[model samples]
Target chain A: VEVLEVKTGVITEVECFLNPEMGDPDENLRGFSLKLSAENDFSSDSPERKMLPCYSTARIPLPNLNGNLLMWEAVTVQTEVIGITSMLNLHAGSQKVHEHGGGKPIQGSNFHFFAVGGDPLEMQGVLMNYRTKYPDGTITPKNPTAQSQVMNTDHKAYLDKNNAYPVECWVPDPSRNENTRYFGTFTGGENVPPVLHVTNTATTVLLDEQGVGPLCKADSLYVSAADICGLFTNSSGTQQWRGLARYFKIRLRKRSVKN
Target chain B: VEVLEVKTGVDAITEVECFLNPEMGDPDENLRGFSLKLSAENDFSSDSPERKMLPCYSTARIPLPNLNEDLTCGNLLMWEAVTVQTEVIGITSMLNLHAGSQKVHEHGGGKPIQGSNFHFFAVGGDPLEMQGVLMNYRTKYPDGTITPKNPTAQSQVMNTDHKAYLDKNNAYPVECWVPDPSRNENTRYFGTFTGGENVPPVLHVTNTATTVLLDEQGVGPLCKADSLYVSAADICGLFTNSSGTQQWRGLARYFKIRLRKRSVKN
Candidate 1:
């Protein structure tokens, strides 16, 4: 077996429906890929079965090709039920104070939101940028904090692709409100280069709750995630919000012989 | 072993130096691909070792994560020597045309002709295109008679990811040409769909005479064709209009893979 393609990016969204959440083709949900399984057979004992460090494109040191597409055939998807841990969900119509509640859709692992013609309630506008800093990790909303920072080119392209223009990049701007919809592909490096670096050694820990340990064959699992917007309410605390999305699949690849 | 990359096109340039004819890399000869030796060992006598037809893209498909720009590792390539018999040859800049004219480099094989760069040359303002034909079930040079109505798009991006702009839709114009000339690749498809009912087959074939046939456990003879073009002038009654080229190091992949598209007819 050969590795036909390898894709990597931030696991933005997980557990998404193929068609519309409500079963309408016109309302199909764009899926965002969190993880993919390359069909291979290996075992926990096999050194090759363990997950290797992902390779950054810049470090590619051989005669190679390029990657820009996401469509693929899932030969076999062994899903793990991460069990929904207090689901968080959002809709494009939730209104906030002073038009700040420009409801934009959240991006998932697959699929994106698009806009239709002549409608007006488009996208969300961000009033205050949010962030959560932790000892081991930092969470940032995927949006532009300031209007001055948005490039006209990036704004238009993103809108055209998503069929919506939103006030803020974080939310899924509705296509009807052309001004607030989100669109366009953005590379993190180009938009915002990391300014700080950690020089000191950091201790890392590996944890496995499974008493059997070292993952085996034939195990299924579900996935779930939490968003800060859904966790905490608005700045003024006018309206409370919580998100709960369900049925998205997640899994750990069991190593086999042919991998 | 899994077939990784299989590529077939009009003409591919030899990146290395080799010997096909008595004369080596002379700029005045013409050259083309004959066959290659595989790098792995297998059962030589098995039916799978003969003319196995793998996908064209299997020659360069690497499975490992790319290390860097300097190295391309863990790939597979399979090929067979295709023989073309020509009586005369001459010297130009292409290697295949030159026969016994120069020996800048050489490889062991049936003492074949060198390869070349350009595929078709303009005969006075009118270009004379070549074809892949067979004589007595063997590969042979076409009788400059058939011409494609669709002009070939410039083979500008050969061996790369670039797709062809010129196809059967565009008549083979006098000025259109593919840059990297590959015998196996070039003549693969010619007359397949130019207003004719039965398109000319993509490739022609001949019984290869292997002085040293590369088998599963043994290395076979592979060389460059750079001198035959210069010799063809006297032998084929054609002007010596090409030069010589070097041959790359490759092995023969013995697999008798046959593809029958039409349902087996009774």
Candidate 2:
């Protein structure tokens, strides 16, 4: 079924909770990430399946019509965020990976949320740095090796630098729907999961500027997201991806057809 | 159905469109009782066979193409419906709150049917074959209770096993929410009748409610027997007349489903 025009309902005031498996205290409060694969069931095989890292992003499937194919296009995406608060050394420039000594603490809260639109087949193994922006107002991919990238389960490398940035230096699973397009935003502040007295708004356009874009064939709309709350480090130099629950209000209308 | 008034390149067929008259008693004389006997195919006989009576807040399926023609086979003639719009008619003439039998049982401080719940569906299977997917939204609560005073909640749910029981008074409040993004394969479109007490927001019936029946996956309903089953739970609202006796009163639903021929790119 072709989308005639997209309209967004009210942004939920309270965030919807998403946890594939719940009941880990630290991960529950600070947010966590997980990847499960039969390929990683045993360490002796090829790639061992570990807890990966404490990252937070969810792949949601949007419902479709009874018996029609709903395709995705570069449409205007408007969204919101909550739970923004401050923490120590939570900013990007606070501590470098090989810092011989502790530098000044970067005291700001930041977050990154990446959205992919379209068919999962076409989006496999595609990097999201082409679409994401840095917290300092710089576009991702200033060069060939820019740290910004989408998260995939297949990549074995970890973010040795600002590893707190879920997308930076992180590889996403290539086996997932590879055909869809990805979009994301980086909002920085001292507040971790920014607490919203009212609402915070952000807007982005998926795909191209005009006309129908990508075809979404999966049973549900695939929107994988990460609520990046910078990173938290302990005395030993090990760091983790800190996150909090986020609320959003989005509008997705269909393209009006022509006879 | 040729394309005269058009939206785009898509040539949509305006298939079934009709007004479903309510079976509840009339409001003019203040008669609010469920007394309609209906056949399986929506044929109403004053004396129905097998006593399969249609009660207030109950549902019935109406088959399309009234002449009993099989619409399953076609090159491009095979019909696939994409969207549907409905309106709750006769609300203006409805008995006002606390206007029905309120003194008889004298409950809820003489409150009329202000808030009502309406559950509706338009599908592509035999009406009998499609069991109830309606799970009460309130059952998820700790003690199975809810109110404006205590507004904590749970996800909307349903059971695939049994037919829905929608008849008892205060059994199921109209304003309680239903889960969107239905998990049922046969459900083409689902909407709730909401308003009045403790209901989060008031969704008034305006011109007509319209919805695209496609799931997030983009799959629309594929009619099994070339037959489209239309069902409605128009639990209009709760009405307690002069005697304080309360009961549910359902209303009629008007449907306009746009169908088109199935194809690779439709």
Candidate 3:
């Protein structure tokens, strides 16, 4: 499915929701990652799948602009975690001693996602944080951790956990090839339970040589994800791990090329 | 096929090597304050009749190989960056929740038995920048107090110096604050496995900790003997006994790294 909301001749934003395997909105969990595949290569044993669980892959074919070469030079992204309240059993107090006597409510695999272009198999340098996410979120200056002190309070909610984190790294597309299509991956970690939430917005900016937005691409954009969300924690410990379905809302735009 | 060599014109490459030692702590484990195992050669039937066991922090040298043979075009090797991945194996006895109580008991110890946080370095140049910012958590008082009354997130005032290596009992102790901002060099990578007062956070077997050690120019650590000196503060997190006393105990592991080639003129 080619989901696009074209703005100017050179700009667009892609939005979508990643749901659990049951396809229920209430099944969001932490550590759940979502992957968007632009190419039509979603095999069960793909190397990329090795890093994900509760996997789901979608192929969003882009328009082949008469075979015109398009390069995604720069990009920015924001994530909104939905329905974190689904699992209310969180720590009652500080980092140490607690009533619930459990781990931190916001603990789990950090948010991870990737974008790909051209043939999925040969694509190298897939954009991703060299490391995993932490609950504090304040590791990097740009993506500061949320300042929530209590659990179940509005601040502790997934949305308020600074779920709306913005990533402003101008990572060069590893592919470095001008193509007519694109893809993405949004998945979570399985170490901790999945944190059930929706990927409210997945936005992108396709830049040209001179650093502007929205360039033309090929026939279709493929997408895939394994939103493991987070896992279920019993009084004793955490369950293995699980995943949820996701909804995506994407937009496409065209920017002027310097070349 | 183990394709160890790559040919990209004069863009030559070489390998750097070193083994990191686990710097253990005192008895109580943490700065004369904090404190903190597992599994079995158990016969299951016999009370105590088994083989010897090695703690995770046991040290051994993993010789670094010289990759200068057929892969290089010149005598000089310019280092670009190094990628390293480490594993935490030996402590599975404590980690086996199922093997212990056999009652589906989780939250075994509710802590990373071996202090999951890792502070390590592979230095090629002088150790000045490496040790210059070292601080003793018990004595380094920004507020002038003997102990830090209110610790803030000051990344600049931290270092691995002053931190003790292995203690009399082979326990590794480290300060609560590391990845210190005081150390400005970029030749180190700091991290921690899933740990805390919480249950042993699940880190899958496939989940290996990896990082790229790079300098300011995104290059690798240039060494004198072309050799790199390595040091690690593998904080094993905290250990709490049934009586409620807790201590920090750390262990050591091996490092496998790959260094790529970079041109001097860049």
Candidate 4:
């Protein structure tokens, strides 16, 4: 069962992998979340504090069969939001809920996404219009220079990995992305936000009824999350779509394919 | 050791030629859209002659040629359905929710279809068979429609004798009938039902996605006769009315079941 390639007897190996970047470090506490904030009025805050449609992204590479296109595609996955309890509580308050000013309740569209593929997850830029203030190639190559010479244009040259982590706010490109199997959800809308049911003591099975998961392409798998966390109403009854960051963990199983 | 082999079986991978279109059993050929229409209730106040949009399941008895069966000296061959490639056609057309008056909702007649979703298919040798699963024992099907025969008011589930064939269109309310799930020795069926009043319909329609219909023993539906029975139900979702009562909405499913001959001892 450990062998990477065995054509007989259900040849496959299951790997449970955790993307460290997506991990909520404060899981041992009441609950932890990577916070992202977005204001309703795009220009209501200082140049340093204004961010609309805030979201985070990450990429994980899986083991390919020796050195070829063959790799362990995810047959299924089991993971849950690290801290859904306090995150949904109307009473409890955290930095994620109060980064704007006072503690606020979550409202508006919450985005969740996951994809398994051969290459990088294609994303289209949105909400970040200010080129200099929110420039491209910033969080892309992930880990930047350590307190560099203030203006390090060589930021692209640093951390030159295959698919670097992205803190930029971008939605998945819908037009062209054939090499991936992605799933996303926007739970609330204008009709009614309704009761946002939160849970943690549960296992979310990503497998289809056929017991098949995303088949990896080019030996790569990708997963991401972006939740609109709060309503930043600055004492004026005005609301902003606040976003909370989420960490996703995936399990992959190696399975071969044929033409 | 690599000398000419004396025995090498046929294309160990059998790909049968089969396809089935939707037979929603609407009022007529012009009205037979993807949606199956069911009356809301036998009530006069709940919108006159309430036509509720519910699921319609279609079954086909595709005739395959006698499997090159001139074999008197070799193993008897039987076709086994293994995999399928299916999709919901006219998916984009679902936006026009103006037609098909099962009920007129709070606004614009009805809401988008979402919830009580189901899509399942079966492959067998003969015709796909079914038993009764009643929602309301006194539920009424359209005139001349075939329901599970002898459905008792007290008996929620039907007996074996109360059998029906899925050969035609628009029989009972899709929920009122279901695959026997038992004693279908010669067939294999795969289905999924998500329960909700407002569950959004998530259509996974892709040519790359294939559904393997084989059972745990690595066996597929054994074609008993020359007929390849393929049954399907694409209960797209649910629609709500101004009255807030919801009804099931459905689209026709296209099936492409690949079946090949499996050798068996005579």
Docking quality band of candidate 1, CAPRI definitions: incorrect
Q: A163-190 in candidate 3: lDDT tens per residue?
A: 2221211111211224322332222222
Q: What does candidate 1 score on TM?
A: 0.16
Interface Cα RMSD of candidate 2 = 28.7
| TM-score, predicted candidate 4 vs. hidden true structure | 0.49
What DockQ does every candidate get? 0.01, 0.01, 0.03, 0.03
lDDT of 2 at B3: 18
Against the true structure, what is each candidate's TM-score?
0.16, 0.33, 0.40, 0.49
lDDT of 1 by residue, B1-266 (tens): 12222332323212111111221111111221111121234333322311111101001111211112333334322222232221101110011111221221232101122222111111000111233221111111122222223222322222232223222211221112232233323122111112221111111111111122233544221221111110000110111111322232111111111111111112
| DockQ score of the complex predicted as candidate 2 | 0.01
lDDT of 2 by residue, B81-136 (tens): 67775654333222111122232111211222333455564454333222232233
DockQ-based class of model 2: incorrect
- By TM-score, who's the top model here? 4
CA RMSD of each candidate after superposition: 28.4, 23.7, 16.1, 14.0
How far does residue A168 in candidate 2 sit from its true spot (Å)?
62
| Model 2 residue B185 lDDT score | 64
lDDT of 2: 0.35
For each candidate, what is the lDDT? 0.19, 0.35, 0.32, 0.46
